[PDB]
């Protein structure tokens, strides 16, 4: 609303008043006036910074900057009187600041200068700098990878509030998938620093643990990034095909180093939902066996799980275990099993058997 010069003269008179207040500040009623003067002074500091910021934005094409702001935020700016701007709506302030830093970071100019200007006028500097580094990393082989790793360290340093979807998206634009992976896992770890989600899931996701459920959900949101990246890789692998497929393979062989038990569980859930049961047999995970036996006893659609269990145990050469698995699978009263598949199982059973057990044989 105010071009830079009126704001400069106003800041001149205002910082003059501030000088007076600081100079004379040492010189039920008195304490009351002291509270009122303290409020006046703190508001004055807020107002000096605010007018400096308004001039800062108007000197940098205010219309374009707030044009990037949200239309609802623009309308709220239309109804906001600057008294409410300084007093109550720090959100519009942070949003306009982010909008200007975003204008700069999309214009691919260094953010250090605007950052120092902000820190000097209304103390987002390091955030803007990292943003510039990342966005420029799309326009820069060895050096590109180096800058990608540096932006990765930067964005994982602030992994609490980093917009994981957009960061991973720009990391997908430069084929820097390892960045998306490490950033997803770092955001997960830092988001739930105690692992309340793992205790929740391990306790059976009992409904009473709102905090455990919440931390698990936040880890899930973090992992959703790597999930989407792998899904895009596989989709473009099927539509280039082999390139995005190697993207998928590299993403997954990365995610297979992951030690988060709930993450292995979710990965299993997705993969089985993804019908890649071969890749399921193809990767080493502790919880698979557990998660399997659990789901098999708990899903009530056990047929799928139990078959997969006989399979996996076979691939691990655990003959008698897979044996008993398929054995129950066959015996199970269920309408989804016709005599044929039953006998075919019992066959595979005796065969894995010849591969106490003598009793099992005698029974069978």
């Amino acid at each position: 609303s105010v071009t830079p010069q009126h704001l400069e003269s106003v800041l001149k008179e205002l910082k003059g008043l501030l000088e007076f207040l600081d100079r004379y500040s040492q010189f039920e009623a008195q304490l009351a006036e002291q509270f009122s003067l303290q409020g006046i002074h703190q508001l004055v500091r807020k107002m000096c910074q605010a007018l400096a910021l308004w001039k800062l934005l108007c000197e940098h094409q205010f219309s374009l900057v707030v044009s990037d702001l949200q239309k609802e935020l623009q309308e709220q700016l239309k109804i906001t009187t600057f008294k409410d701007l300084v007093i109550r709506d720090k959100e519009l302030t942070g949003a306009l600041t982010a909008s200007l830093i975003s204008c700069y970071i999309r214009d691919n100019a260094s953010v250090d200068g605007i950052s120092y200007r902000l820190q000097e006028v209304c103390p987002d500097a390091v955030c803007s700098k990292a943003n510039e580094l990342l966005q420029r990393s799309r326009h820069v082989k060895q050096e590109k990878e180096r800058m990608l790793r540096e932006s990765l360290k930067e964005y994982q340093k602030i992994s609490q509030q980093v917009d994981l979807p957009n960061v991973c998206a720009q990391y997908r634009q430069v084929r820097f998938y390892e960045g998306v992976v490490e950033l997803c896992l770092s955001a997960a770890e830092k988001k739930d620093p105690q692992g309340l989600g793992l205790h929740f899931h391990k306790n059976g996701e009992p409904e009473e643990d709102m905090a455990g459920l919440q931390a698990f959900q936040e880890r899930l949101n973090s992992y959703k990034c790597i999930t989407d990246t792998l899904q895009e890789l596989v989709n473009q692998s099927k539509a280039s095909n082999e390139e995005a497929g190697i993207h998928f393979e590299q993403m997954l062989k990365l995610a297979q180093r992951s030690a988060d038990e709930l993450f292995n569980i979710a990965l299993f859930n997705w993969l089985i939902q993804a019908d890649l049961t071969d890749k399921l047999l193809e990767l080493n995970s502790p919880f698979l066996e557990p998660h399997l036996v659990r789901m098999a006893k708990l899903d009530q659609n056990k047929v799928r799980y139990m078959d997969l269990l006989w399979r996996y145990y076979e691939k691990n050469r655990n003959f008698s275990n897979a044996a008993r698995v398929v054995a129950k699978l066959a015996d199970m009263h269920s309408p989804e099993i016709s005599l044929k598949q039953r006998l075919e199982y019992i066959s595979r059973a005796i065969l894995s058997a010849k591969s106490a057990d003598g009793e099992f044989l005698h029974e069978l």
Partner: protein
Amino acid sequence: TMNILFTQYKRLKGVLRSQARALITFAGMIPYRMSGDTNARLVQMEVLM
């Protein structure tokens, strides 16, 4: 027989399933103790498809 059909799915890779199934089921019903390592190769190859 199963080694052959295996190589068949091998070349097709590098019905066969239902045929292999018929063979394994035969092995099971057969009132004669085939040798052990026999059963071993049978089960393993039946899996690897």
